[PDB]
Amino acid sequence: KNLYHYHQYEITLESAVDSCKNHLQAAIGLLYSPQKCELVKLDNSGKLVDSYNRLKFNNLGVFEARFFNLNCELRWVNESNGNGTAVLLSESDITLTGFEKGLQEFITAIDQQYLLWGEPAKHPPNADGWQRLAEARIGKLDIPLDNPLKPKDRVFLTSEEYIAEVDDFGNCAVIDERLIKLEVK
RNA sequence: ACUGAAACUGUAGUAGAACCAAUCGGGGUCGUCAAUA
């Protein structure tokens, strides 16, 4: 049982997304910038509607990103001037141009949940495939969810933790966690 | 790769109960005084 991971270096974010786009289809992105943490959704093709401008670094731009869908997750972090390391995590063996494949054996993987911030807002956003949670603590949170949220729905980010031996003594740990999807409970 | 936000150590509770500032006492009445030569 292997967790496959694919790594590329000195690559810009928008190139990293494009180089992965056949796998990141419909992925939720979480982009990290000095001023904003924003969710995005890639097209079912995997593109983003302002991709270059959205993923540009040089003007308070994206220094870290995570893209996740059912099959895989892309991670990117800026090393210098908007060029940085991409790692894609997938439980499936897959081919990528330029990415060096690796793998980790893991003993088992276990489901985990994270409750998202907020209750369903009294109306969803005007954008299709978006919903609004809100909590007085943070205000609105627009999430790329296509289910119309019922009152007293709660949204959970589901993840899978991979457990492996860290020591030659046999000590186990969770070696990584892959984010999967938003789910309504 | 960037300070969280916002939140009254307040709310109720009598320094009080008990203890006599009191007990006894006719506003009365008679023998001297002094020490030397």
Burial A155-180 (b: 16+ CB within 10 A, else e): bebbbbbbebeeeeeeeeebbbbbbb
Q: Which residue(s) pair with A86 in the sheet?
A: A8, A76
Q: 């982009």: which residue's tokens? A: A31
- The nt closest to A37 (CA vs C1′) is B1
Angstrom resolution of this structure:
2.5
**Distance B26 C1' – A30 CA (angstroms):** 116
* Nearest in space to A68 (alpha carbons), one of A96, A87, A95, A49: A87
Q: Tell which strand B nucleotides have any atom below 7 Å from a protein Cβ.
A: 1-2, 4-5
- Quickly count: other Cβ atoms within 10 Å of residue A47's Cβ: 14
**Distance B22 C1' – A129 CA (angstroms):** 99
Distance (Å, whole) CA A30 – CA A65: 6
Q: Which residue(s) pair with A41 in the sheet?
A: A28
**Distance B37 C1' – A108 CA (angstroms):** 149
- The nt closest to A138 (CA vs C1′) is B5
Tokens encoding A38: 């924003």
- The nt closest to A35 (CA vs C1′) is B2
- The nt closest to A78 (CA vs C1′) is B1
Q: How was this structure determined?
A: cryo-EM
- The nt closest to A84 (CA vs C1′) is B1
- Quickly count: other Cβ atoms within 10 Å of residue A36's Cβ: 9
| CB < 7 A contacts with chain B (nucleic strand) | A 34, 60, 63-64, 77-79, 84, 137-138
